[PDB]
Tab-separated table of C-alpha atoms and ligand atoms in Angstrom:
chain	number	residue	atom	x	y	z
A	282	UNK	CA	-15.227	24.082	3.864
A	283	UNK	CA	-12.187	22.257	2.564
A	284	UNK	CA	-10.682	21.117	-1.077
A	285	UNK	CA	-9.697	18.170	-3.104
A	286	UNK	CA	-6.580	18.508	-5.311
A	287	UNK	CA	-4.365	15.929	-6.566
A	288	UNK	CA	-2.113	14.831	-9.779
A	289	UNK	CA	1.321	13.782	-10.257
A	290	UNK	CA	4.721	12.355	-10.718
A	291	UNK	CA	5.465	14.342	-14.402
A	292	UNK	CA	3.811	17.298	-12.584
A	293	UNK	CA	7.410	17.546	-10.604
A	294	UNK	CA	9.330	17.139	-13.829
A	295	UNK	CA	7.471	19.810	-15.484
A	296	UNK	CA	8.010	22.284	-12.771
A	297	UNK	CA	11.561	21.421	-12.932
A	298	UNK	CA	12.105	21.507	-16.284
A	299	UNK	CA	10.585	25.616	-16.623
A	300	UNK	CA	14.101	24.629	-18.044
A	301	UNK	CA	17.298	24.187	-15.781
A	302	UNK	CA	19.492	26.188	-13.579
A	303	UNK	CA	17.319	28.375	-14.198
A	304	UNK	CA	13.589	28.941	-11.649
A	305	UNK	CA	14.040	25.238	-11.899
A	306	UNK	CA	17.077	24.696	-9.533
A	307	UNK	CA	14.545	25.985	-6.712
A	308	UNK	CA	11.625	24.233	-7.853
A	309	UNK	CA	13.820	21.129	-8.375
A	310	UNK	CA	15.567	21.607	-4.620
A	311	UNK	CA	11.431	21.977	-3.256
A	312	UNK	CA	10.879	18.187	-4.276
A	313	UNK	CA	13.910	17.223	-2.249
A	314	UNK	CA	11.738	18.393	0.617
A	315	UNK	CA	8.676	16.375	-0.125
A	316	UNK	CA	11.825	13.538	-1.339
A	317	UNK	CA	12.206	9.418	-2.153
A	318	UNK	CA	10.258	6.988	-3.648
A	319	UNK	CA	10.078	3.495	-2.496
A	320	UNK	CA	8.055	0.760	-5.033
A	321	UNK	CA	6.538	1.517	-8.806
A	322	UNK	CA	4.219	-1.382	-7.909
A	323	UNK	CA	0.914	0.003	-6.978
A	324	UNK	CA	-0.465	-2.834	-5.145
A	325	UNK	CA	2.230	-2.323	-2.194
A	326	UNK	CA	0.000	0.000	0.000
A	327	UNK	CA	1.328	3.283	-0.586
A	328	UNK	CA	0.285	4.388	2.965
A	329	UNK	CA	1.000	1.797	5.860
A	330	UNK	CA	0.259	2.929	9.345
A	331	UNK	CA	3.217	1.091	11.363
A	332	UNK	CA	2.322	1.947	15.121
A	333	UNK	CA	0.598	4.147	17.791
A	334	UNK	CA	2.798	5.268	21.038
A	335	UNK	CA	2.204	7.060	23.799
A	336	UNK	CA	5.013	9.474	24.087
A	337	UNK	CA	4.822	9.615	28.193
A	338	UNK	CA	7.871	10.323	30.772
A	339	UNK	CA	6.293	8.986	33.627
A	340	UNK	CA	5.160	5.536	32.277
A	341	UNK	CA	7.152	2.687	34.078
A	342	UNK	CA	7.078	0.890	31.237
A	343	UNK	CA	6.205	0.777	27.021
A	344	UNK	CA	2.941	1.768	25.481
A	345	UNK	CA	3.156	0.968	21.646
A	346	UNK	CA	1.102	-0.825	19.228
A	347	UNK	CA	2.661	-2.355	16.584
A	348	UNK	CA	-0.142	-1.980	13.884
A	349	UNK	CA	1.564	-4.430	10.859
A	350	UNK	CA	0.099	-7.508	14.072
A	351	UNK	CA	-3.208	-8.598	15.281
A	352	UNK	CA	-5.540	-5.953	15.261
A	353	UNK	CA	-7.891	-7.702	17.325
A	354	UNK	CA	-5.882	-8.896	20.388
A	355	UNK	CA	-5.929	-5.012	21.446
A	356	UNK	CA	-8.852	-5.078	22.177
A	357	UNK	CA	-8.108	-7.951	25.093
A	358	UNK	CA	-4.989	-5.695	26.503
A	359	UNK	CA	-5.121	-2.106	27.283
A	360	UNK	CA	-2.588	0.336	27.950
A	361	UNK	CA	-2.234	2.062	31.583
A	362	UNK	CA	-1.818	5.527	32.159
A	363	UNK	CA	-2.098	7.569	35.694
A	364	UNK	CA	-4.570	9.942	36.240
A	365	UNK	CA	-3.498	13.744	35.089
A	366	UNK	CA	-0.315	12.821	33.086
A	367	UNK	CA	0.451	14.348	29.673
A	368	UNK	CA	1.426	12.508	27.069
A	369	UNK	CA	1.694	12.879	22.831
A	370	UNK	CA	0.142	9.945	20.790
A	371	UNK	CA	2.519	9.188	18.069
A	372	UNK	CA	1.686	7.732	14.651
A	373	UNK	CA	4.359	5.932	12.736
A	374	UNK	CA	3.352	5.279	9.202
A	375	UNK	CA	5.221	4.861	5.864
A	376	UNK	CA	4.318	7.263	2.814
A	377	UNK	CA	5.900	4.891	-0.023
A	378	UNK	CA	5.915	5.814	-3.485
A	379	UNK	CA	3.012	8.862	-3.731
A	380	UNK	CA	1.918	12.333	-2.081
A	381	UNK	CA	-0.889	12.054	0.179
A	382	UNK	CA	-2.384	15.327	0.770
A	383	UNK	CA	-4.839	16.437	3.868
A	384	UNK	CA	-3.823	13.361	6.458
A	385	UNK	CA	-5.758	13.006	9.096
A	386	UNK	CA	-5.447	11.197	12.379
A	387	UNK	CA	-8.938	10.665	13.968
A	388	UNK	CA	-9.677	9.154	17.675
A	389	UNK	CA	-13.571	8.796	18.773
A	390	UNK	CA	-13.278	7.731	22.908
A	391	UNK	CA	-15.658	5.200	24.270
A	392	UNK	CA	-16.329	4.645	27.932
A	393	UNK	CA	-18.919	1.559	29.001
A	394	UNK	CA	-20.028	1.057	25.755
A	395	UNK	CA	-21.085	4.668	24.582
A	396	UNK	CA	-18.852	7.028	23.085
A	397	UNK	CA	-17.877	10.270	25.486
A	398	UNK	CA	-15.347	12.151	23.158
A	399	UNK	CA	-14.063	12.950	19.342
A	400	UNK	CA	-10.559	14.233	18.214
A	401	UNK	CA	-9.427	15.105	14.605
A	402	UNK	CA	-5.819	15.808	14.343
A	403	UNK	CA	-4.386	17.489	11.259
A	404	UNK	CA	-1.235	15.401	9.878
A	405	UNK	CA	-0.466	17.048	6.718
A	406	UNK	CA	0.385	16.450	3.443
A	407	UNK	CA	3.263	13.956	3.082
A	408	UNK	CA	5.600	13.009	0.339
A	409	UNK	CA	7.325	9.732	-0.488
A	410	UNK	CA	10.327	8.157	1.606
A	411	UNK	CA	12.684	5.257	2.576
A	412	UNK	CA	12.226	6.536	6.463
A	413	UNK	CA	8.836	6.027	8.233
A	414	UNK	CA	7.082	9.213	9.233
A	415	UNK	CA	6.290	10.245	13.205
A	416	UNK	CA	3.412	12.395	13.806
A	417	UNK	CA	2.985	13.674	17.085
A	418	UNK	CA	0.076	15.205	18.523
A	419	UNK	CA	-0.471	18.282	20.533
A	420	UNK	CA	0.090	17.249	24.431
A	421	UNK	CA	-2.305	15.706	25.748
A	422	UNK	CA	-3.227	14.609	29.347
A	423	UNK	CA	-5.205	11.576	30.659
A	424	UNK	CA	-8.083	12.682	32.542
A	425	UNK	CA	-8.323	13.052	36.374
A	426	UNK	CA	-11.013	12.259	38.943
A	427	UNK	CA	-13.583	9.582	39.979
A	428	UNK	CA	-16.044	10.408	37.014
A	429	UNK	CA	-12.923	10.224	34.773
A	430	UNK	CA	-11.053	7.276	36.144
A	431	UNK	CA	-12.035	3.665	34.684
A	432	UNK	CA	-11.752	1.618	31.126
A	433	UNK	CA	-11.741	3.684	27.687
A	434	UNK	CA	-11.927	2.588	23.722
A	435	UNK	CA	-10.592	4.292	21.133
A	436	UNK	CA	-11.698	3.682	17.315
A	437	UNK	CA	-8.897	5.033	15.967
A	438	UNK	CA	-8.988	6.214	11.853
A	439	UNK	CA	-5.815	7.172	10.213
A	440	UNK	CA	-7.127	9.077	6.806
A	441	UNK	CA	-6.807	11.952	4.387
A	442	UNK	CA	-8.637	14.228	1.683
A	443	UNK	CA	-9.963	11.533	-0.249
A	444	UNK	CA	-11.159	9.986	2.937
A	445	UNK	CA	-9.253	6.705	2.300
A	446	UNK	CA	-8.789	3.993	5.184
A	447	UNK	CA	-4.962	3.919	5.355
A	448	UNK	CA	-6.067	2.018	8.724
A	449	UNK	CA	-8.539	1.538	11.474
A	450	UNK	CA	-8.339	-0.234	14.858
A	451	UNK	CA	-9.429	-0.135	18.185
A	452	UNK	CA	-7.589	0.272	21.870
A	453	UNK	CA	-8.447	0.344	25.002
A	454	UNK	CA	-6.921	3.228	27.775
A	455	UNK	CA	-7.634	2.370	31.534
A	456	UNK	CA	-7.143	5.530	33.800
A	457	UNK	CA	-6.225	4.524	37.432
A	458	UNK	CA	-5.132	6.578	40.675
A	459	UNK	CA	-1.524	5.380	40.039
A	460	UNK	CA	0.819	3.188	37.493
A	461	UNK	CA	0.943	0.598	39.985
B	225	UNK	CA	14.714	30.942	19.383
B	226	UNK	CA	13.872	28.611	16.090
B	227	UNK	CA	11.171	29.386	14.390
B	228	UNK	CA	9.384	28.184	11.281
B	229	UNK	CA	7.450	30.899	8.963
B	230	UNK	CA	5.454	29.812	5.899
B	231	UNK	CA	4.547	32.441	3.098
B	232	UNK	CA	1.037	31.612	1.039
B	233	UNK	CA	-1.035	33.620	-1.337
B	234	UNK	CA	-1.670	33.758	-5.550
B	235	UNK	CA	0.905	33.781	-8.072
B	236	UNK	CA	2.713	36.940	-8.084
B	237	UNK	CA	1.496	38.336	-5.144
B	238	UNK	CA	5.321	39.418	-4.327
B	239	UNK	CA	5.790	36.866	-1.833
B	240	UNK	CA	9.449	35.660	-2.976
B	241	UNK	CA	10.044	39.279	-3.449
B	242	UNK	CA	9.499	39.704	0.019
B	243	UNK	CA	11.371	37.360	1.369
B	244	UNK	CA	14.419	38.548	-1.056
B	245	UNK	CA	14.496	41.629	0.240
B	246	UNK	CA	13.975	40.986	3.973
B	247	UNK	CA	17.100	38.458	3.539
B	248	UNK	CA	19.460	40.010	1.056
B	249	UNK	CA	18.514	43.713	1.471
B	250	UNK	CA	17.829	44.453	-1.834
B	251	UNK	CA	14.992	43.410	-4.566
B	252	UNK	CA	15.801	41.311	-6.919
B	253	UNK	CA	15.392	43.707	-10.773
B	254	UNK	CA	16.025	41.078	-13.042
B	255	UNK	CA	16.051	37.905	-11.968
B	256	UNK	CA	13.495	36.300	-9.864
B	257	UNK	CA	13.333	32.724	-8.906
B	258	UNK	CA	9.422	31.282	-8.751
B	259	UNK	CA	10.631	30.325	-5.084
B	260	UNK	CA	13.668	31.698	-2.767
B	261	UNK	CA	14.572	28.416	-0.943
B	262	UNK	CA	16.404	27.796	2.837
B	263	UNK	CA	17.420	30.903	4.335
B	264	UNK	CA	17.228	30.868	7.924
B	265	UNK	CA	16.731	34.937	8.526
B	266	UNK	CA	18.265	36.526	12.097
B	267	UNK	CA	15.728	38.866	13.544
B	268	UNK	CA	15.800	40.118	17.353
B	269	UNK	CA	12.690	40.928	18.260
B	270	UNK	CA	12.696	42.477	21.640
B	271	UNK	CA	14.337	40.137	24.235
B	272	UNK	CA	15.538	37.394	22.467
B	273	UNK	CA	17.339	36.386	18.940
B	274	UNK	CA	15.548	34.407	16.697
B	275	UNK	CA	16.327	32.167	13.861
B	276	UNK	CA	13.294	32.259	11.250
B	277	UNK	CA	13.167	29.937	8.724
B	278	UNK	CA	11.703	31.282	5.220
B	279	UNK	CA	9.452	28.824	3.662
B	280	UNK	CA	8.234	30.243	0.388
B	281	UNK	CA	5.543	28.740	-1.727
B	282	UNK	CA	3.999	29.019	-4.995
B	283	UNK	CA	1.153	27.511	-7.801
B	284	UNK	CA	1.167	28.889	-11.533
B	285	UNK	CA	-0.375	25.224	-11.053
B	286	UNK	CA	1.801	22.214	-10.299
B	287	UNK	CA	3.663	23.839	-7.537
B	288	UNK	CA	0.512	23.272	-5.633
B	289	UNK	CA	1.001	19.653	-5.733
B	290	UNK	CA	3.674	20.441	-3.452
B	291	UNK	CA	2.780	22.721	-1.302
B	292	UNK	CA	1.086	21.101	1.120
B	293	UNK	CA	4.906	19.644	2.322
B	294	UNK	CA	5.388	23.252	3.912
B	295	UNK	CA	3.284	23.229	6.314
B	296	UNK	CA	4.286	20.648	9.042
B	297	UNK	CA	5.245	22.558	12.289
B	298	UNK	CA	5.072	26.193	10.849
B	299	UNK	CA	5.194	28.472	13.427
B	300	UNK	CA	3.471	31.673	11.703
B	301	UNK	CA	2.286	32.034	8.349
B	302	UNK	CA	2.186	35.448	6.418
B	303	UNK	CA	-0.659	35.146	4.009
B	304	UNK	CA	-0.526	37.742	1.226
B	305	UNK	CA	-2.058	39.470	-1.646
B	306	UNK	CA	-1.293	42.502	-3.700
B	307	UNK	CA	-2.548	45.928	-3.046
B	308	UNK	CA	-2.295	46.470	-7.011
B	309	UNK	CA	-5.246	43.385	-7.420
B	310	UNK	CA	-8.488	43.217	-5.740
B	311	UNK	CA	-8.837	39.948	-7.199
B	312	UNK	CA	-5.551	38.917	-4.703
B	313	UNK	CA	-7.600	40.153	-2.114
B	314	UNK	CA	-10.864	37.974	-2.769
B	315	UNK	CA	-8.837	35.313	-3.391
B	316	UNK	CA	-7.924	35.368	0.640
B	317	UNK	CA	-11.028	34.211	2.101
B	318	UNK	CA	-11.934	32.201	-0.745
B	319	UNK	CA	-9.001	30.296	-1.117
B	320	UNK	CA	-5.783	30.846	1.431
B	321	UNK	CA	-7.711	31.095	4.324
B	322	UNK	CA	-9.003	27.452	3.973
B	323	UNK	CA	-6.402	25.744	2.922
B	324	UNK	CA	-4.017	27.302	6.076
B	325	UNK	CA	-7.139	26.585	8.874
B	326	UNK	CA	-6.778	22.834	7.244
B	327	UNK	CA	-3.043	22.335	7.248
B	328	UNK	CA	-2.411	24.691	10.186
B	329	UNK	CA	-5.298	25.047	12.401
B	330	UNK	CA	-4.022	27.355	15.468
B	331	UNK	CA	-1.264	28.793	13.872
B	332	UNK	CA	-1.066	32.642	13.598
B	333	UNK	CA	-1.921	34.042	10.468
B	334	UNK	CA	-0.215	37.767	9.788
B	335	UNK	CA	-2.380	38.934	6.788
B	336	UNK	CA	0.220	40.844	4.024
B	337	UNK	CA	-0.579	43.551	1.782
B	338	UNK	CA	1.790	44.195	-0.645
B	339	UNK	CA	2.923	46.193	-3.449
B	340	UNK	CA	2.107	49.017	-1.476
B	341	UNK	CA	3.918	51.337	-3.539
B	342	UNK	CA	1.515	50.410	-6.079
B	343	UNK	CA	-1.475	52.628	-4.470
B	344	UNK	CA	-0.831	55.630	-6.255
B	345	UNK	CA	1.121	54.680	-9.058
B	346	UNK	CA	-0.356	56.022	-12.016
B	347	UNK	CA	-0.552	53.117	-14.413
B	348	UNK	CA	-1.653	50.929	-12.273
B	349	UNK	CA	-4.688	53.459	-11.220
B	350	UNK	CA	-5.278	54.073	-14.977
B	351	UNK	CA	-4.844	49.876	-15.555
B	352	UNK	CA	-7.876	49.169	-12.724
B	353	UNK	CA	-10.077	52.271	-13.364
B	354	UNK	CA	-10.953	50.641	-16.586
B	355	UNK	CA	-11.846	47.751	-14.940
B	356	UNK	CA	-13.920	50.283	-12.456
B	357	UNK	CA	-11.512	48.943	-10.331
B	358	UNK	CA	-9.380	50.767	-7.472
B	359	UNK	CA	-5.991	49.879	-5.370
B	360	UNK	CA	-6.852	47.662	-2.448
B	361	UNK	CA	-7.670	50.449	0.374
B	362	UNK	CA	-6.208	49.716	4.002
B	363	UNK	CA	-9.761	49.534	5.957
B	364	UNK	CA	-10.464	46.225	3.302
B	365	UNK	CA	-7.190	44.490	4.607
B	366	UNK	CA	-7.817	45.210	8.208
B	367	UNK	CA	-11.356	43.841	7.961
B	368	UNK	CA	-10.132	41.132	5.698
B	369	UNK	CA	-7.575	40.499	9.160
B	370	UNK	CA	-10.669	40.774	11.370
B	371	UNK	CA	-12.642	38.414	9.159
B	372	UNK	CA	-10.657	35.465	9.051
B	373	UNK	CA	-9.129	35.306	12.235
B	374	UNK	CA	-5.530	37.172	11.605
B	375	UNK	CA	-3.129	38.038	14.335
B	376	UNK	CA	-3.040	41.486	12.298
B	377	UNK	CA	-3.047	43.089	8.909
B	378	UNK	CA	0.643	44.817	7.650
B	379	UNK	CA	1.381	46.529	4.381
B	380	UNK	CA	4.310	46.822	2.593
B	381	UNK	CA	6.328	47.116	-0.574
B	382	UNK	CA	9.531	44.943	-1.170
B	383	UNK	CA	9.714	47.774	-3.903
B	384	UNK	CA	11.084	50.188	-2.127
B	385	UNK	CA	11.695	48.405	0.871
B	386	UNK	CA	9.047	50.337	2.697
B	387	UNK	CA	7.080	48.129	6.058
B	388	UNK	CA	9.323	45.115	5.075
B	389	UNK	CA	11.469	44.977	8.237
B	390	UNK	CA	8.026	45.284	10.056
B	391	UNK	CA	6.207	42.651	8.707
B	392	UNK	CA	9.172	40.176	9.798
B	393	UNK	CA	9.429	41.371	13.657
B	394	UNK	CA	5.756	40.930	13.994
B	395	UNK	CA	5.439	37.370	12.156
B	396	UNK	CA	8.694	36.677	14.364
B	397	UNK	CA	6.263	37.845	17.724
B	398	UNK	CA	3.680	36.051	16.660
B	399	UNK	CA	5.279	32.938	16.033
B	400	UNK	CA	7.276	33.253	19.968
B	401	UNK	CA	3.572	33.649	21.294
B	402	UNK	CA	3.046	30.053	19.359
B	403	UNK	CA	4.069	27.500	22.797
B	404	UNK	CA	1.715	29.717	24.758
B	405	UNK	CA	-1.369	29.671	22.543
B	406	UNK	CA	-0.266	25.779	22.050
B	407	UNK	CA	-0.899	25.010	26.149
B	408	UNK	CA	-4.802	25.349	24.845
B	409	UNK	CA	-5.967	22.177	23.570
B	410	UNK	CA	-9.504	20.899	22.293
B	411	UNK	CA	-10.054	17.403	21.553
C	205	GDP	N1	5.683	47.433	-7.815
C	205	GDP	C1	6.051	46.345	-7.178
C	205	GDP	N2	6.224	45.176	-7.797
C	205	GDP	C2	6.630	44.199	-7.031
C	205	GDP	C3	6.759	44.202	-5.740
C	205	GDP	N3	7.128	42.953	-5.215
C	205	GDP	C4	7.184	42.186	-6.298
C	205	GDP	N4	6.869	42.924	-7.445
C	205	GDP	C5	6.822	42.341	-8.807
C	205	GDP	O1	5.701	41.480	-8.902
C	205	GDP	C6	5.945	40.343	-9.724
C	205	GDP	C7	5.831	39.102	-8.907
C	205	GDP	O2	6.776	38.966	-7.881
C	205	GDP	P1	7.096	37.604	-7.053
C	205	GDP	O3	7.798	37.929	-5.799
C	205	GDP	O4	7.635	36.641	-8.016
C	205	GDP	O5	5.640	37.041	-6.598
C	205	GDP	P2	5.291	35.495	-6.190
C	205	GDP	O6	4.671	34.714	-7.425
C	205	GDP	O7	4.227	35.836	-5.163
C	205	GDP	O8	6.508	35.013	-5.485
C	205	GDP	C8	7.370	40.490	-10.230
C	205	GDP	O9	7.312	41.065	-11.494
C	205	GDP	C9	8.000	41.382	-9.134
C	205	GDP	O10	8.965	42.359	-9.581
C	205	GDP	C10	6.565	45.402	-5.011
C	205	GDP	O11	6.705	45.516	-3.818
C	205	GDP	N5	6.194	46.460	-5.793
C	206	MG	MG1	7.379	33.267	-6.081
C-alpha cells in the first residue's frame, strides 16, 4: 469548507524543467523536501500505518502498538496511564511511493459502551520516503477524577482528503489513581 | 529561538520578493526565482534572537502539488495578496484562508498587503479604473484580518523596501507567542 486537489509524478518534472538552472534549480531543490520513492508497484500500500505510542515520561514501562500484528488482540490488553499525566500519541506510518495530501489522524473515545469524546488531528500532506514518518500530537493529558477514572476505547482512523482507510483499529486506555 | 514561517497567497502576489528583500537587502530587478529556498533569517525581536526559517511557496499550477509539504510545524504564516489586485484580495477568504485553517489550524496568520507602492502609481490606477476597479484600500485588509481570524493586517512594498522589516518582527512575535497559545488544547 475544505478542497480536493491531486495529480502527479510528471507534474514535478514539469516544474523542474521551466528549463534548468534556471527557476528550476529551486523548484527542483522543493521536491527534495517532499523527497524518495520506495516501489513503482501500486499494489504495495502506498500508505502503511506502522504503530501508535504514547510518548509519556512517567510511564514505568512501554505503550506501543505495533499496527503491521493482530488488530484484534488489542482489544483484550489495554494500555495504563495515571490519572493527570500528559502525554503525545505518536503515529508511525510509511508514505511509499506517492503524495498524500490532507492526512488526518482521527480518535472517537468510548467509555462503558457509549462514546464520550471525538478528536481530529491534522497530519499534513506527506511526500514519499525510505524513512517512516512520526506524527505527534499536541500534548495531551489523561483525565483526572472519579467520574474520569475507569476503562476507555478508542476507534482510531488514520485518513486523508480523499477519505481513504490507510487504517482503522481499536484500543483500550484504563485511567487509574496510580501506574501501579 | 527557532522558528518556522510559511509564506502563502496567488501567483505573483510578491511573496518571494518579500522574502528577497527581507534576507538580502535588496529586490531582486532582473532575476526572480518562482521560489527563494532555505534561508534561515536573524531577527531580534525584543528580548531574544531568533532564527526564522523562510518557507516560500507558490502555484502557476503544479507547484501546488507540493505545497502542502510546507506546512508541518510552521510556526506563523504570512498570508498575502497585492494591493495592485483586488482579485488577490478575494482570493484570501476564498481560497488561502481554507487551505491554512486545514493544514495549520491554530497557527497565527499575519495577513500581508503588498505592493504598497503600487497605491498611487499612475498606471496601475489608470490599468484598474478601466476595470472600475481601485488599489486595495487599508480599511479592506484590516477587515479582511478581522474576518478570518488574523493576528493582524501589515502593508508593505519589497519595492522600495518600505514596512518590510516590520512585517518580519511581527510574524517573528507572533510565532514566539506560538508555545503559549499551544498550552490550549480541544479534543
Ligand atoms: N511594484 C512592485 N512590484 C513588485 C513588488 N514585489 C514584487 N513585485 C513584482 O511582482 C511580480 C511578482 O513577484 P514575485 O515575488 O515573483 O511574486 P510570487 O509569485 O508571489 O513570489 C514580479 O514582477 C516582481 O517584480 C513590489 O513591492 N512592488
Ligand atoms: Mg514566487
Amino acid at each position: 469548507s475544505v478542497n480536493y486537489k491531486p495529480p502527479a509524478q510528471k507534474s514535478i518534472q514539469e516544474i523542474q524543467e521551466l528549463d534548468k538552472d534556471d527557476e528550476s534549480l529551486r523548484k527542483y531543490k522543493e521536491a527534495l523536501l517532499g523527497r524518495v520513492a520506495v516501489s513503482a508497484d501500486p499494489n504495495v500500500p502506498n500508505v502503511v500505518v506502522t504503530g501508535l505510542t504514547l510518548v509519556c515520561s512517567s510511564a514505568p514501562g512501554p505503550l506501543e502498538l505495533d499496527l503491521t500484528g493482530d488488530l484484534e488482540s488489542f482489544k483484550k490488553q489495554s494500555f495504563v496511564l495515571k490519572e493527570g499525566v500528559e502525554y503525545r500519541i505518536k503515529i508511525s506510518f510509511r508514505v511509499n511511493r506517492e503524495i498524500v495530501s490532507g492526512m488526518k489522524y482521527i480518535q472517537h473515545t468510548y467509555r462503558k459502551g457509549v462514546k464520550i469524546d471525538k478528536t481530529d488531528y491534522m497530519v499534513g500532506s506527506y511526500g514519499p520516503r525510505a524513512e517512516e514518518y512520526e506524527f505527534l500530537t499536541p500534548v495531551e493529558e489523561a483525565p483526572k477524577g472519579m467520574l474520569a477514572r475507569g476503562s476507555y476505547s478508542i476507534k482510531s482512523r488514520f485518513t486523508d482528503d480523499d477519505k481513504t482507510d490507510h487504517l482503522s483499529w481499536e484500543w483500550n486506555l484504563t485511567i487509574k489513581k496510580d501506574w501501579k | 529561538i527557532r522558528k518556522k514561517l510559511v509564506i502563502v497567497g496567488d501567483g505573483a502576489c510578491g511573496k518571494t520578493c518579500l522574502l528577497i528583500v527581507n534576507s538580502k537587502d535588496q529586490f531582486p530587478e532582473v532575476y526572480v526565482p518562482t521560489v527563494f529556498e532555505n534561508y534561515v533569517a536573524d531577527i531580534e525581536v525584543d528580548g531574544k534572537q531568533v532564527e526564522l526559517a523562510l518557507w516560500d511557496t507558490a502555484g502557476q499550477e503544479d507547484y501546488d502539488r507540493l505545497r502542502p509539504l510546507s506546512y508541518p510545524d510552521t510556526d506563523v504564516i504570512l498570508m498575502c495578496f497585492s494591493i495592485d489586485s483586488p482579485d488577490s484580495l478575494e482570493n484570501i477568504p476564498e481560497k488561502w484562508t481554507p487551505e491554512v485553517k486545514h493544514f495549520c489550524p491554530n497557527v497565527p496568520i499575519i495577513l500581508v498587503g503588498n505592493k504598497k507602492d503600487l497605491r498611487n502609481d499612475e498606471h496601475t490606477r489608470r490599468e484598474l479604473a478601466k476595470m472600475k476597479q481601485e488599489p486595495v484600500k487599508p480599511e479592506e485588509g484590516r477587515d479582511m484580518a478581522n474576518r478570518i481570524g488574523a493576528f493582524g493586517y501589515m502593508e508593505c512594498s519589497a519595492k522600495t523596501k518600505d514596512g518590510v522589516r516590520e512585517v518580519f518582527e511581527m510574524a517573528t512575535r507572533a510565532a514566539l507567542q506560538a508555545r503559549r497559545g499551544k498550552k490550549k488544547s480541544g479534543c
